[PDB]
């Protein structure tokens, strides 16, 4: 933001935003799968109890 | 909806300055266009006039 004009800062920030939100989506998907695994484990534990 | 026709006269060397995201004396102290400008720009020499 502090070195370039708004027209160019727009493109640069666009690249950064794309990368970061892609990273967030990857993290969320991993969390969903791991949570499904934990839910299966918890159901087994409750059945054993 | 409407058409705004803005007219003036300047030296040819500054013609390039009339565009979105431009810099210069014209672009900063004389006539400023928005970055998301939509429309047309027309210029022709008038040295005879």
CB B18 within 8 A of CB B26: yes
Backbone discontinuities in chain B, residue before each (C to N > 2.5 A) = none
**Where does residue B29 fall: left (phi above 0), alpha (psi -120 to 50 degrees), or beta otherwise?**
alpha
Give DSSP secondary structure letters for A1-49: --SS-HHHHHHHHHHHHHHHHHHHHHHHHHHHHHHHHHHHHHHHHHHH-
> DSSP code of B19?
S
Phi/psi at A2 (nearest 5 deg)? -95, 10
Q: Give B38 to chain A, closest Cα distance, Å.
A: 16
- CB distance from A32 to chain B under 8 Å? no
- On chain A, the residues whose CB falls within 8 A of the CB of B21 are 5-7
- Dihedral of CA atoms B31, B32, B37, B38 in degrees, nearest 10, equals 0
CB B14 within 8 A of CB B24: yes
Resolution in A: 3.2
Q: Give A8 to chain B, closest Cα distance, Å.
A: 9
Residue of B nearest to A4 (CA): B21
**CA B44 – CA A5 distance, rounded (Å):** 29
Is B35 in Cβ contact with A6 (below 8 Å)?
A: yes
**CA B12 – CA B39 distance, rounded (Å):** 21
- Indicate which technique resolved this structure: cryo-EM
């Amino acid at each position: 933001l502090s070195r370039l004009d708004p027209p160019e800062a727009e493109v640069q920030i666009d690249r950064l935003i794309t990368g970061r939100l892609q990273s967030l989506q990857t993290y969320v998907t991993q969390q969903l799968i791991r949570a499904a695994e934990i839910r299966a484990s918890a159901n087994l534990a409750a059945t054993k109890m | 909806t409407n058409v705004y026709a803005d007219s003036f006269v300047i030296r040819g060397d500054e013609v390039r300055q009339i565009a979105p995201g431009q810099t210069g004396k014209i672009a900063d102290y004389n006539y400023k266009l928005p970055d998301d400008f939509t429309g047309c720009v027309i210029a022709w020499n008038s040295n005879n006039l």
